Amino acid sequence: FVGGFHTRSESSLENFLGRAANTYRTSFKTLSTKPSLKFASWTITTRKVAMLRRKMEMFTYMRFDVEVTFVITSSKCKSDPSSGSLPVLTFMVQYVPPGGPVPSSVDSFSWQSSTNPSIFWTQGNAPPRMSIPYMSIGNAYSNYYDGYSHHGADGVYGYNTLNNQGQLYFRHVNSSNPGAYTCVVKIYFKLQHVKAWVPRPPRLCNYQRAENVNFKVQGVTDTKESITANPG
Amino acid sequence: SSNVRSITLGNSTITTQESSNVVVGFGVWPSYLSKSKSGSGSTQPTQPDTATERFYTLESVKWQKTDNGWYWKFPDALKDMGLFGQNMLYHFLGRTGWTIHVKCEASRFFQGALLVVCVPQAEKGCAVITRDVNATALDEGDKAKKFTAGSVSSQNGVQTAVYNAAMGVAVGNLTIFPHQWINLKTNNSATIVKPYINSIPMENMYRHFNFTLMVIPFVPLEWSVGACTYVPITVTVAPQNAEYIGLRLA
Amino acid sequence: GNPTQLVPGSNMYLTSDDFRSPEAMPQFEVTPEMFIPGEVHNLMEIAETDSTVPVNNVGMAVNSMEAYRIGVNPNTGSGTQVYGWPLNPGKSSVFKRTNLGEILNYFAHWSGSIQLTFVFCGSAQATGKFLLAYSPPGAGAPTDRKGARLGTHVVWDVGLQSSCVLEVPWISNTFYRKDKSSGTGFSKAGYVTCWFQTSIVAPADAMSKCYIMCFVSADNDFSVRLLKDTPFIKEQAARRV
């Protein structure tokens, strides 16, 4: 190449880890007999997306802010065609910080708690966006925890209670006579202002569980026919 | 003959080769929390215990032809030793660095290579991927736990296949952690100085293993017929800058 | 001027945009940072650390510690090849799972130089000579010890040194995607091969089989570009771990 083309800005922490990814998709409805189908929930975690988890786990401790963008689409269910009228749907995205009240239905009071920040969003606008700061009581998040959550027979190995980042809840904001609609929400995740400590070997084996490091034994690399190099 | 030096800490003395190199983990020497002794020290006083600064020598292990490796979980490896072990019971919070010596007793007629590595937060996987490891499978204090050559199938045990290092990574990549190689034709000991490494300034020493010491033979032991059939390996630990929560009124 | 016009691209979501975002918790005072040892600023710091190469990735040796060790028998083999592999640290089965290799599989293009360390783990009484031959890209592996000696090479005397270090230039990616079908042979990459100059000899009490270990890391400033998804994760996006 040219006289000094040596570039490594793409392997900096921010460019390695600061890429918006789709970490969860789910649906909720305006009308249903089953109450749990009328709202959606998601505990904020990176451990259920394999590609992000592997990259994040080359480090032991981390600090970052999180930027969340919501891509929300809706469709009409199959029902009576008299409701050709489509008043524009409004949505509520609720962040519940660590320690906040959690809703049990669409009618729970926790949808109105002044300490759960919410976005109210109507279809046809730019997608809603919200940022969450660094949320731990401790000084860093931990990707690995070689300990027990508490001293009991109910302690969980590898569970650090200080990695709690909150939850997100989704429901329609209905008027008196809503129609039957289904909405799918895609959550987009971006890490900001990332710091990391104590690098680790990349994960070799397949991920088995979202909550621990369990693995099936895997060979260190793939095989070749001979140890020597032969002139083809 | 090579120069040797004697080190006395408290009421213990060991000898080391002056030509032995020391690995300081991440280049950081252990120290106290003194840099942040502002107002927080009034509502959260801490006290040192300098009588924990002595050499604790564990039970030696025998490096054999069929040996796959050993590991020791720390703080936990010293829970039954002395004033250090007693302080783990009396103080709810603590922090400490360490000086670790790993020495081999081998002759010039023995061959083999070991990796000595200190792995912070060495979370180990279970031998059944739908279950969870019991505490006894992770450590038993002073007694060393062993790796195996291949996969095991214990119900609640550790997956101890050595080439995955019980963590699901390629064992050849463990040089990213503070480490020293022992090649029996060039050297027979390793010294690693470990600072305190955690996401919080202090923690409970019975609940959390801060790091794990691993001794893994990459090249197996071999010798001629009639020679000693094993090489003893001795681990010696000296806590550095141990600090605990205060027990007095404000 | 207060009166404005909205341009194409307004109200769209570009996943690589960089805009100021509204804060959900503006009253929250975050935990102050504390010094932690081992802070990482760039992924090339990982790649500059030596890791063991599984040179003996043949047969069942990948399912044990034998992949990492190269066997050398005493009293045999003068003039024969001990081992060899192409110089493709990203795509070859020899290098793809090392610290350097896994970092390089996250990028579509890279270039630099690699540092190779060879360690003889035999007894202090075992002596012999090895030829470490380097073939530049486009040349192909040597066929005999004479051809290896006629090119770039280092004579490694394990009776004098336990270690030998090679710094190999002109290392660069060869394909836009992962092409391991040319994994054994790359027409754009060179080779390193090891030859018996002499056999390994010893006294009667050091007749044991000996081993060589190989280490690899990025030698100097290594360049990477075009971050991509690593090919070592598949079918797991569907399984959700």
Q: Which of A151, A198, A217 sits opposite B159 (nearest CB)?
A: A217
The answer to whether the beta carbons of residues B81 and B56 sit under 8 Å apart is yes
Can you name the residues that pair with B9 across neighbouring β-strands?
B12
**H-only helix segments in chain C:** 44-47, 99-104, 145-150, 236-239
Q: How far apart, in whole angstroms, are the C-alpha atoms of residue A136 and residue A134?
A: 6
Domain boundaries defined on chain A: 17-78+85-199
Contact B167 A212 (CB under 8 A): no
Phi, psi angle pair for C40, to nearest 5°? -110, 130
Resolution (A): 2.3
Neighbours of A (≥3 Cβ pairs closer than 8 A)? B, C
Rounded to a whole number of angstroms, the distance from the CA of B69 to the nearest CA of chain C is 11
Q: Which of C36, C207, C213 sits opposite B224 (nearest CB)?
A: C207
Tell how many helices (H) and how many strands (E) occur in chain C. Answer: 4, 11
Q: How far apart, in whole angstroms, are the C-alpha atoms of residue A23 and residue A168?
A: 12
- A 10 A CB-CB count for A2 gives 5
Going from the C-alpha of C72 to that of each of C84, C133, C198, C208, the distances in angstroms are 14, 18, 12, 9
Q: How far apart, in whole angstroms, are the C-alpha atoms of residue A60 and residue A141?
A: 8
Chain A residues touching chain B at CB-CB below 8 Å:
60-61, 136, 138-142, 144-148, 150-151, 156-158, 160, 162, 198-205, 208-209, 212-221
Please give the domain boundaries of chain C with CATH numbers for all domains.
44-220 (2.60.120.20)
Count CB pairs under 8 A between chains A and B.
113
Q: Which of B181, B185, B224 sits opposite C124 (nearest CB)?
A: B185
Q: In the structure encoding, which two tokens stand for residue C230, read together? A: 């690593």
Residue with tokens 């006290």: B47
The answer to whether the beta carbons of residues C166 and C132 sit under 8 Å apart is yes
Which chain A residues touch B211 with a CB distance below 8 Å? 146
From the centroid of its chain, how far is CA B117? Answer: 8
Going from the C-alpha of C22 to that of each of A95, A124, C9, C19, the distances in angstroms are 13, 19, 20, 10
Q: In chain A, positions 18-77, which contact chain C (CB-CB < 8 Å)?
A: 19-20, 47-51, 53-55, 58-61, 63, 67, 69, 71
Domain boundaries defined on chain B: 21-27+49-242
Q: How far apart, in whole angstroms, are the C-alpha atoms of residue C121 and residue C83?
A: 16
Nearest CA in chain C to B227: C205
Q: In the structure encoding, which two tokens stand for residue C28, read together? A: 């929250």
Residue with tokens 């806590």: B239
Contact C93 A224 (CB under 8 A): yes
The answer to whether the beta carbons of residues B124 and B138 sit under 8 Å apart is yes
Can you name the residues that pair with B140 across neighbouring β-strands?
B143
Which of B28, B123, B214 should we substitute to test contact with A (largest number of A Cβ atoms within 10 Å)?
B123
DSSP of A86-118: -PPPEEEEEEE-TT----SSTT-GGGG-TTS-E
DSSP of C62-104: GGSGGGG-EEE-TT--TTSEEEEEES-TTTSTTTTTSHHHHHH
**The three-state (H, E, C) secondary structure of chain B, written as one string:** CCCEEEEEECCEEEEEECCCCEEEHHHCCCCCCHHHCCCHHHHCCEEECHHHCCCEECCCEEECCCCCCEEEECCHHHCCCCHHHHHHHHCCCEEEEEEEEEEECCCCCCEEEEEEEEEECCCCCECCCCCCCCHHHHCECCECEECECCCCCCCCCECCEHHHCCCCCCHHHHHHCCEEEEECCCCCEEEEEECCCCCCCCECCCCECCEEEEEEEEEEEECCCCCCCCEEEEEEEEEEEEEEECCCCC
Rounded to a whole number of angstroms, the distance from the CA of A97 to the nearest CA of chain B is 21
Which of A135, A197, A217 should we substitute to test contact with B (largest number of B Cβ atoms within 10 Å)?
A217
Contact A157 B132 (CB under 8 A): yes
Can you name the residues that pair with A181 across neighbouring β-strands?
A76
DSSP, collapsed to helix, strand or coil, labels residue A132 as: strand
Going from the C-alpha of B118 to that of each of A143, B31, B99, B177, the distances in angstroms are 18, 18, 11, 6
Which of B169, B175, B207 should we substitute to test contact with A (largest number of A Cβ atoms within 10 Å)?
B169
Judged by a CB distance cut-off of 8 A, whether residue C63 touches chain B is yes
- A 10 A CB-CB count for C1 gives 3
DSSP, collapsed to helix, strand or coil, labels residue A152 as: coil
Q: Which of B135, B176, B201 sits opposite A199 (nearest CB)?
A: B176
**H-only helix segments in chain A:** 13-17, 50-56
CATH architecture of B21-27+49-242: Sandwich (2.60)
Q: Is C115 exposed, middle or buried (0-12, 13-18, 19+ CB in 10 A)?
A: middle
Dihedral (Cα; B151, B152, B157, B158), 10-degree rounding: -20
Q: Is C27 exposed, middle or buried (0-12, 13-18, 19+ CB in 10 A)?
A: exposed
- A 10 A CB-CB count for B12 gives 14
CATH number of the structural domain A17-78+85-199? 2.60.120.20
Q: In the structure encoding, which two tokens stand for residue A193, read together? A: 């202002």
Q: How far apart, in whole angstroms, are the C-alpha atoms of residue B74 and residue B78?
A: 7
- A 10 A CB-CB count for B48 gives 14
Q: How far apart, in whole angstroms, are the C-alpha atoms of residue A138 and residue B69?
A: 34
Which amino acid, A72? I
The answer to whether the beta carbons of residues C200 and C128 sit under 8 Å apart is yes
Going from the C-alpha of A177 to that of each of A83, A98, A173, the distances in angstroms are 11, 35, 11
